[PDB]
Amino acid sequence: GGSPVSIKVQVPNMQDKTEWKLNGQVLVFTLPLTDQVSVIKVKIHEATGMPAGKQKLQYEGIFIKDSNSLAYYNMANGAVIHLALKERGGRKK
């Protein structure tokens, strides 16, 4: 199946919001391509203290889901997941 690969997280630029440390940085980790992107959200919560319940997943500018896996988005060693603040229910276009 999917092997472990390096995945980065392009954190948002929000260092003055509350208590976390979001400064546009990248957080790298190693996870199997079969691990749903939802794993990444946890990795930021350790690297910044921001809970996964309020994070937006993106890969190369593509809004990915937490239920999708890295293999589904063709991600591999050196991939970059842009994190954004998302705490609201959103809205129609």
Tab-separated table of N, CA and C in Angstrom, residues 4-86:
chain	number	residue	atom	x	y	z
A	4	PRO	N	5.228	5.675	3.841
A	4	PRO	CA	5.430	6.947	4.511
A	4	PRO	C	6.164	7.923	3.599
A	5	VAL	N	5.727	9.183	3.626
A	5	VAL	CA	6.308	10.264	2.846
A	5	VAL	C	6.388	11.530	3.684
A	6	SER	N	7.266	12.446	3.274
A	6	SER	CA	7.420	13.724	3.946
A	6	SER	C	6.294	14.665	3.540
A	7	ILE	N	5.606	15.226	4.533
A	7	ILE	CA	4.541	16.177	4.281
A	7	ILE	C	4.778	17.425	5.099
A	8	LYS	N	4.764	18.574	4.429
A	8	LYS	CA	4.938	19.867	5.070
A	8	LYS	C	3.577	20.504	5.278
A	9	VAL	N	3.541	21.522	6.131
A	9	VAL	CA	2.317	22.261	6.387
A	9	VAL	C	2.571	23.760	6.355
A	10	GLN	N	2.221	24.406	5.243
A	10	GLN	CA	2.293	25.850	5.085
A	10	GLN	C	1.284	26.517	6.020
A	11	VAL	N	1.648	26.641	7.295
A	11	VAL	CA	0.836	27.295	8.312
A	11	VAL	C	0.407	28.696	7.867
A	12	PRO	N	-0.769	29.178	8.307
A	12	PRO	CA	-1.251	30.516	8.005
A	12	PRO	C	-0.408	31.555	8.744
A	13	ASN	N	-0.599	32.838	8.438
A	13	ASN	CA	0.166	33.896	9.085
A	13	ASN	C	-0.657	34.570	10.184
A	14	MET	N	-0.825	33.881	11.317
A	14	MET	CA	-1.651	34.345	12.428
A	14	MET	C	-0.936	34.123	13.760
A	15	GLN	N	0.084	34.931	14.050
A	15	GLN	CA	0.856	34.767	15.278
A	15	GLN	C	0.356	35.668	16.408
A	16	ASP	N	-0.523	36.622	16.092
A	16	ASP	CA	-1.021	37.591	17.058
A	16	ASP	C	-2.488	37.340	17.423
A	17	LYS	N	-3.085	36.257	16.909
A	17	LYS	CA	-4.504	35.996	17.124
A	17	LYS	C	-4.843	35.653	18.572
A	18	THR	N	-4.293	34.555	19.104
A	18	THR	CA	-4.673	34.127	20.449
A	18	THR	C	-3.484	33.714	21.318
A	19	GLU	N	-2.922	32.523	21.103
A	19	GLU	CA	-1.796	32.029	21.892
A	19	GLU	C	-0.910	31.063	21.099
A	20	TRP	N	-1.401	30.586	19.953
A	20	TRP	CA	-0.677	29.675	19.078
A	20	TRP	C	0.473	30.407	18.384
A	21	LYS	N	1.208	29.712	17.507
A	21	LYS	CA	2.325	30.316	16.791
A	21	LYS	C	2.252	30.080	15.283
A	22	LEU	N	1.292	30.709	14.604
A	22	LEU	CA	1.168	30.568	13.162
A	22	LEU	C	1.906	31.733	12.502
A	23	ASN	N	3.027	31.466	11.826
A	23	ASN	CA	3.852	32.524	11.257
A	23	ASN	C	4.244	32.239	9.810
A	24	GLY	N	3.335	31.620	9.051
A	24	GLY	CA	3.585	31.293	7.654
A	24	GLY	C	4.633	30.195	7.479
A	25	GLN	N	4.959	29.465	8.553
A	25	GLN	CA	6.046	28.494	8.530
A	25	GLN	C	5.593	27.176	7.904
A	26	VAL	N	6.536	26.271	7.634
A	26	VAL	CA	6.187	24.923	7.205
A	26	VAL	C	6.569	23.923	8.288
A	27	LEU	N	5.632	23.032	8.629
A	27	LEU	CA	5.902	21.969	9.584
A	27	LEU	C	5.954	20.643	8.839
A	28	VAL	N	7.110	19.977	8.850
A	28	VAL	CA	7.288	18.723	8.132
A	28	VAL	C	7.047	17.530	9.050
A	29	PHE	N	6.493	16.451	8.490
A	29	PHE	CA	6.233	15.226	9.222
A	29	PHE	C	6.422	14.039	8.285
A	30	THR	N	6.264	12.812	8.788
A	30	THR	CA	6.335	11.631	7.937
A	30	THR	C	5.147	10.714	8.192
A	31	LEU	N	4.334	10.460	7.164
A	31	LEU	CA	3.112	9.669	7.291
A	31	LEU	C	2.843	8.898	6.000
A	32	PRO	N	2.177	7.739	6.092
A	32	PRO	CA	1.903	6.863	4.963
A	32	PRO	C	0.909	7.524	4.019
A	33	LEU	N	0.998	7.222	2.721
A	33	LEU	CA	0.093	7.837	1.768
A	33	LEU	C	-1.355	7.425	2.015
A	34	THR	N	-1.575	6.391	2.832
A	34	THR	CA	-2.921	5.915	3.134
A	34	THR	C	-3.495	6.580	4.377
A	35	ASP	N	-2.704	7.415	5.050
A	35	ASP	CA	-3.193	8.156	6.191
A	35	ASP	C	-3.933	9.369	5.664
A	36	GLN	N	-5.233	9.396	5.932
A	36	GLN	CA	-6.090	10.512	5.590
A	36	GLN	C	-5.495	11.802	6.128
A	37	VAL	N	-5.559	12.861	5.321
A	37	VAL	CA	-4.996	14.176	5.594
A	37	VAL	C	-5.379	14.662	6.994
A	38	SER	N	-6.473	14.140	7.559
A	38	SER	CA	-6.907	14.470	8.916
A	38	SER	C	-5.763	14.339	9.921
A	39	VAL	N	-4.800	13.445	9.657
A	39	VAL	CA	-3.639	13.266	10.522
A	39	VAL	C	-2.828	14.554	10.601
A	40	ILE	N	-2.675	15.244	9.468
A	40	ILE	CA	-1.921	16.483	9.401
A	40	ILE	C	-2.446	17.507	10.396
A	41	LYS	N	-3.771	17.659	10.506
A	41	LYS	CA	-4.363	18.680	11.365
A	41	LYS	C	-3.887	18.509	12.806
A	42	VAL	N	-3.668	17.261	13.222
A	42	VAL	CA	-3.188	16.967	14.566
A	42	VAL	C	-1.753	17.441	14.698
A	43	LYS	N	-0.975	17.289	13.623
A	43	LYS	CA	0.435	17.633	13.644
A	43	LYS	C	0.633	19.124	13.885
A	44	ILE	N	-0.266	19.960	13.352
A	44	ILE	CA	-0.197	21.395	13.601
A	44	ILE	C	-0.533	21.704	15.057
A	45	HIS	N	-1.475	20.957	15.640
A	45	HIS	CA	-1.915	21.169	17.009
A	45	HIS	C	-0.783	20.905	17.996
A	46	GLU	N	0.247	20.156	17.585
A	46	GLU	CA	1.410	19.940	18.438
A	46	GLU	C	2.496	20.967	18.139
A	47	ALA	N	2.537	21.445	16.892
A	47	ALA	CA	3.570	22.358	16.437
A	47	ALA	C	3.198	23.811	16.721
A	48	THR	N	1.942	24.066	17.098
A	48	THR	CA	1.460	25.430	17.290
A	48	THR	C	0.468	25.537	18.436
A	49	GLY	N	-0.237	24.444	18.735
A	49	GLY	CA	-1.211	24.416	19.807
A	49	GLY	C	-2.621	24.743	19.325
A	50	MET	N	-2.799	24.981	18.015
A	50	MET	CA	-4.112	25.236	17.448
A	50	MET	C	-4.830	23.911	17.206
A	51	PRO	N	-6.078	23.766	17.670
A	51	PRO	CA	-6.802	22.513	17.566
A	51	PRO	C	-7.197	22.228	16.121
A	52	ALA	N	-7.292	20.943	15.774
A	52	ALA	CA	-7.628	20.491	14.430
A	52	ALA	C	-9.068	20.844	14.055
A	53	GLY	N	-9.897	21.164	15.051
A	53	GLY	CA	-11.296	21.493	14.840
A	53	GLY	C	-11.483	22.835	14.135
A	54	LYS	N	-10.403	23.607	13.941
A	54	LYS	CA	-10.488	24.905	13.287
A	54	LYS	C	-9.347	25.146	12.300
A	55	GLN	N	-9.119	24.186	11.403
A	55	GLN	CA	-8.040	24.255	10.419
A	55	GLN	C	-8.567	23.884	9.039
A	56	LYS	N	-8.028	24.528	8.001
A	56	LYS	CA	-8.424	24.294	6.619
A	56	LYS	C	-7.295	23.591	5.882
A	57	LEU	N	-7.616	22.512	5.170
A	57	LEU	CA	-6.613	21.736	4.470
A	57	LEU	C	-6.506	22.196	3.022
A	58	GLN	N	-5.276	22.380	2.552
A	58	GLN	CA	-5.007	22.700	1.162
A	58	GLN	C	-3.683	22.070	0.736
A	59	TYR	N	-3.550	21.694	-0.537
A	59	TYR	CA	-2.334	21.115	-1.090
A	59	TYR	C	-2.054	21.774	-2.435
A	60	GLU	N	-0.915	22.465	-2.538
A	60	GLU	CA	-0.536	23.197	-3.745
A	60	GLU	C	-1.622	24.167	-4.226
A	61	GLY	N	-2.479	24.643	-3.319
A	61	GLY	CA	-3.559	25.557	-3.673
A	61	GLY	C	-4.890	24.841	-3.899
A	62	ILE	N	-4.914	23.515	-3.737
A	62	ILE	CA	-6.136	22.723	-3.850
A	62	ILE	C	-6.694	22.439	-2.465
A	63	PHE	N	-7.884	22.945	-2.161
A	63	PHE	CA	-8.537	22.644	-0.894
A	63	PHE	C	-8.848	21.153	-0.805
A	64	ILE	N	-8.018	20.438	-0.043
A	64	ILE	CA	-8.182	19.018	0.218
A	64	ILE	C	-9.104	18.811	1.409
A	65	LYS	N	-9.619	17.589	1.558
A	65	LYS	CA	-10.452	17.227	2.689
A	65	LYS	C	-9.607	16.506	3.725
A	66	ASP	N	-10.145	16.354	4.933
A	66	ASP	CA	-9.471	15.665	6.018
A	66	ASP	C	-9.649	14.159	5.854
A	67	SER	N	-10.706	13.753	5.150
A	67	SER	CA	-11.035	12.359	4.935
A	67	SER	C	-10.270	11.762	3.754
A	68	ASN	N	-9.752	12.604	2.851
A	68	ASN	CA	-8.952	12.135	1.730
A	68	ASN	C	-7.559	11.767	2.214
A	69	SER	N	-6.865	10.906	1.469
A	69	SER	CA	-5.516	10.468	1.806
A	69	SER	C	-4.500	11.140	0.896
A	70	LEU	N	-3.233	11.074	1.297
A	70	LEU	CA	-2.148	11.701	0.562
A	70	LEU	C	-2.010	11.045	-0.817
A	71	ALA	N	-2.240	9.727	-0.908
A	71	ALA	CA	-2.184	9.015	-2.179
A	71	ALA	C	-3.263	9.511	-3.145
A	72	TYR	N	-4.404	9.970	-2.620
A	72	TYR	CA	-5.506	10.436	-3.449
A	72	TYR	C	-5.170	11.792	-4.071
A	73	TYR	N	-4.389	12.610	-3.359
A	73	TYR	CA	-3.934	13.903	-3.855
A	73	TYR	C	-2.531	13.811	-4.454
A	74	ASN	N	-2.033	12.592	-4.679
A	74	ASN	CA	-0.759	12.344	-5.340
A	74	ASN	C	0.427	12.909	-4.562
A	75	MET	N	0.214	13.208	-3.280
A	75	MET	CA	1.254	13.799	-2.461
A	75	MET	C	2.396	12.805	-2.270
A	76	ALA	N	3.596	13.325	-2.017
A	76	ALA	CA	4.784	12.518	-1.805
A	76	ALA	C	5.825	13.334	-1.050
A	77	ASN	N	6.989	12.731	-0.806
A	77	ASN	CA	8.064	13.374	-0.071
A	77	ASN	C	8.286	14.797	-0.576
A	78	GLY	N	8.128	15.764	0.328
A	78	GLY	CA	8.336	17.169	0.017
A	78	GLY	C	7.021	17.906	-0.253
A	79	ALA	N	5.879	17.224	-0.113
A	79	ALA	CA	4.571	17.826	-0.337
A	79	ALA	C	4.352	18.977	0.643
A	80	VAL	N	3.490	19.937	0.284
A	80	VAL	CA	3.244	21.110	1.115
A	80	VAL	C	1.747	21.339	1.276
A	81	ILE	N	1.273	21.282	2.525
A	81	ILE	CA	-0.140	21.460	2.831
A	81	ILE	C	-0.366	22.841	3.432
A	82	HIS	N	-1.012	23.734	2.693
A	82	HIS	CA	-1.282	25.075	3.177
A	82	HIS	C	-2.412	24.987	4.199
A	83	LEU	N	-2.125	25.425	5.420
A	83	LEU	CA	-3.093	25.462	6.500
A	83	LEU	C	-3.711	26.855	6.535
A	84	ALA	N	-5.016	26.931	6.793
A	84	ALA	CA	-5.710	28.197	6.929
A	84	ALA	C	-6.672	28.111	8.107
A	85	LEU	N	-6.985	29.244	8.735
A	85	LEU	CA	-7.961	29.239	9.815
A	85	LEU	C	-9.356	29.025	9.234
A	86	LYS	N	-10.056	28.023	9.770
A	86	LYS	CA	-11.432	27.729	9.407
A	86	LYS	C	-12.164	27.247	10.643
